[PDB]
Design an enzyme around this catalytic site. Structure first.
Site, PDB file in Angstrom:
ATOM      1  CE  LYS A 280     -83.986  18.367 -61.771  1.00  0.00           C
ATOM      2  NZ  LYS A 280     -83.147  19.600 -61.475  1.00  0.00           N
TER       3      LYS A 280
HETATM    4  O1  LIG Z   1     -81.070  17.530 -62.762  1.00  0.00           O
HETATM    5  C1  LIG Z   1     -80.816  17.201 -61.566  1.00  0.00           C
HETATM    6  N1  LIG Z   1     -80.696  15.893 -61.253  1.00  0.00           N
HETATM    7  C2  LIG Z   1     -80.390  15.489 -59.997  1.00  0.00           C
HETATM    8  O2  LIG Z   1     -80.256  14.291 -59.686  1.00  0.00           O
HETATM    9  C3  LIG Z   1     -80.178  16.527 -58.971  1.00  0.00           C
HETATM   10  N2  LIG Z   1     -79.830  16.525 -57.677  1.00  0.00           N
HETATM   11  C4  LIG Z   1     -79.758  17.807 -57.247  1.00  0.00           C
HETATM   12  N3  LIG Z   1     -80.054  18.600 -58.296  1.00  0.00           N
HETATM   13  C5  LIG Z   1     -80.045  20.075 -58.371  1.00  0.00           C
HETATM   14  O3  LIG Z   1     -78.647  20.472 -58.315  1.00  0.00           O
HETATM   15  C6  LIG Z   1     -78.554  21.479 -57.318  1.00  0.00           C
HETATM   16  C7  LIG Z   1     -77.952  20.810 -56.080  1.00  0.00           C
HETATM   17  O4  LIG Z   1     -77.250  21.840 -55.411  1.00  0.00           O
HETATM   18  P1  LIG Z   1     -76.356  21.691 -54.069  1.00  0.00           P
HETATM   19  O5  LIG Z   1     -74.914  21.438 -54.421  1.00  0.00           O
HETATM   20  O6  LIG Z   1     -76.582  23.043 -53.430  1.00  0.00           O
HETATM   21  O7  LIG Z   1     -77.056  20.511 -53.428  1.00  0.00           O
HETATM   22  C8  LIG Z   1     -79.968  22.032 -57.092  1.00  0.00           C
HETATM   23  O8  LIG Z   1     -80.318  22.972 -58.130  1.00  0.00           O
HETATM   24  C9  LIG Z   1     -80.801  20.763 -57.235  1.00  0.00           C
HETATM   25  O9  LIG Z   1     -82.173  21.011 -57.622  1.00  0.00           O
HETATM   26  C10 LIG Z   1     -80.283  17.854 -59.374  1.00  0.00           C
HETATM   27  N4  LIG Z   1     -80.644  18.180 -60.638  1.00  0.00           N
END
Ligand SMILES: O=c1[nH]c(=O)c2[nH+]cn([C@@H]3O[C@H](COP(=O)(O)O)[C@@H](O)[C@H]3O)c2[nH]1
Ligand SMILES: O=c1[nH]c(=O)c2[nH+]cn([C@@H]3O[C@H](COP(=O)(O)O)[C@@H](O)[C@H]3O)c2[nH]1
Lengths: 321, 330
Positions: free
Chosen positions: B145
């Site tokens: 990000k």
């Molecule tokens: O760019 C993003 N926008 C989002 O809305 C978002 N939600 C979760 N994450 C990231 O995705 C991963 C989530 O992993 P899990 O299946 O283990 O929850 C992890 O790497 C989280 O940091 C996001 N990244």
């Protein structure tokens, strides 16, 4: 222990300035330091070695204490590490007497892989020992579970006093940056409000809610979150990043959030006008208006004199106000 | 007519892999301290079964950092290389997950946050993970990000696209889209790169700026999506087989529908299923595109914290593929 709010006030009482020195060494800066030292028989490295707190860095201290001639011959795989760390110690040694705080931008310490993170750790250790308030400029953002890792890196591992945060995803991330519930620890951050880039208007000004521009909505929500976390009750704060070239917004923010903490990059390398910025952002507790100066000091061939002049200029301007 | 591994744009690499394995599963590799600890404990209890299997794999010999250590017998690490134990078990946990699950992955997404909290050691691991995925030819995303002014952000570009050799990364463009010129393009080398910009995220308060802020009755997430696309066109990315796409949370059904409706051919990355409990059928359906690689569904912890990650990954692969088939036969 004391809390960043107290650290900043106490240092301001000792050195009477709001200069924030940016330490963002690039490849050319490191390469130039190496070349220059080799041509002047390592004068600055030799000075570094006489300083007391070099003895208190965490990572590869024995390497850092070796003589340059010997590094080059016997520890050649550490040469980049050695000159990169020594460049940082050199800047800090030449300028710290003029600095209210130092701001290190993470982006400069990552592009070589692990080696620059060892440098960054040693830089934070060195500043910690010198009791100089620190800011990690990393513009962190993620969901809560993930951002806790940044809290650990920044506030536990580096022992930074503060960091910059991008709260576009939302403000709830701050609960996992500025607060550690398990340990009952609180930490400070500056959120991006109005930035220096030429197209900053596109989202920060052109978007709005209820006839207030986005940057205002964002500042107010960050403060709402600060109140929710009770940071200031715990000698910490959430502050704002407002570009030094953004006079109207600086004026607006200081008028409408009269006691906010502001960090203002963009003077020197980016043309920001020091008098106007400091005047529009002025507070009598002037730790509340940090003026960041990076390349105008670190790319200046006389960094001590460059820092002194900014210190002297800021202090003249602070006096007028 | 054949292009060799590493010698093609990310658009082409994704398309080819999607034709190969016929899914849009994106496996997230976010190892936390508990995962590493648990891996070390489990391996110590089972005479290092999984590590010894890692050590059989050809490309472990092709990673950049501390091979001398990675290739040692595990009981030698514990007894003779105590200061390398965490590095070794962290790196081996990652190689284990990759080896067990890669045959099901359209892409792997590694979240930078998980690799930094111990200082330099996790960056060595991260570098090896990217080197290993590059050798296996599995499409990669570095979830960091990133955001800064142009002069600073170039450093992230170097780290991500030159050092790690990542195919893509996530970017927060709240500062502005001009930063993309310094991320998706290298003017000195005349190289182009791909990124996913944050559009609508999964966190509970995501509407506070993404939906509440607007310009002329278009919500911020729509304006940000459009501005990202305008920059992609300016930079000629798609002509050079790269792209700028969007992160849209799995749980954000209305926004996912708007984005796919209004930008029919955009690339979407969708995190937030599994450990965060979005409805897979609903997400995939609203985001669907016949070129599956345009709707990546990220699954992390539901695979990496399962004691049988290969089977967990197969189950998600199959579940996704069944929903893809429903859309194909609608
Ligand atoms: O760019 C993003 N926008 C989002 O809305 C978002 N939600 C979760 N994450 C990231 O995705 C991963 C989530 O992993 P899990 O299946 O283990 O929850 C992890 O790497 C989280 O940091 C996001 N990244
Ligand atoms: O949070 C921020 N909002 C901004 O508007 C901004 N403008 C510049 N920068 C960062 O500040 C430093 C600028 O350093 P120079 O004095 O060398 O230009 C470097 O570390 C830059 O990355 C910003 N950071």
């Amino acid at each position: 222990s004391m809390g960043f709010k107290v650290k900043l006030e106490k240092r301001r009482n000792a050195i009477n300035t709001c200069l924030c020195i940016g330490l963002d060494p690039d490849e050319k800066d490191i390469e130039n330091f190496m070349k220059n030292e080799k041509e002047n028989n390592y004068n600055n490295i030799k000075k570094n070695l006489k300083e007391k707190y070099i003895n208190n860095v965490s990572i590869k201290k024995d390497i850092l204490l070796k003589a340059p001639d010997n590094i080059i011959r016997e520890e050649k795989s550490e040469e980049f590490f050695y000159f990169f760390n020594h460049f940082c110690f050199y800047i800090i040694n030449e300028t710290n007497k003029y600095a209210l705080t130092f701001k290190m931008n993470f982006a400069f310490y990552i592009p070589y892989g692990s080696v620059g993170i060892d440098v960054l750790k040693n830089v934070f250790d060195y500043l910690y020992e010198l009791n100089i308030p620190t800011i990690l400029d990393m513009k962190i953002n993620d969901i809560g579970n993930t951002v806790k890792n940044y809290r650990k890196f920044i506030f536990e591992y580096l022992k930074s006093d503060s960091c910059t945060v991008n709260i576009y995803m939302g403000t709830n991330m701050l609960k996992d940056i500025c607060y550690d519930e398990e340990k009952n620890k609180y930490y400070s951050a500056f959120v991006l409000v109005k930035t220096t880039n030429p197209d900053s208007a596109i989202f920060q000004k052109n978007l709005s809610l209820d006839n207030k521009q986005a940057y205002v909505i964002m500042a107010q929500e960050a403060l709402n979150m600060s109140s929710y976390l009770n940071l200031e009750q715990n000698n910490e704060f959430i502050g704002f990043v407002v570009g030094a070239n953004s006079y109207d917004e600086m004026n607006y923010i200081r008028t409408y959030f009269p006691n906010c903490y502001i960090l203002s990059p963009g003077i020197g390398a980016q043309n920001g006008d020091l008098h106007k910025t400091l005047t529009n952002g002025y507070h009598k507790s002037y730790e509340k208006i940090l003026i960041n100066i990076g390349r105008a000091i670190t790319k200046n061939p006389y960094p001590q004199k460059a820092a002194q002049m900014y210190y002297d200029q800021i202090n003249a301007i602070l006096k007028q106000n």
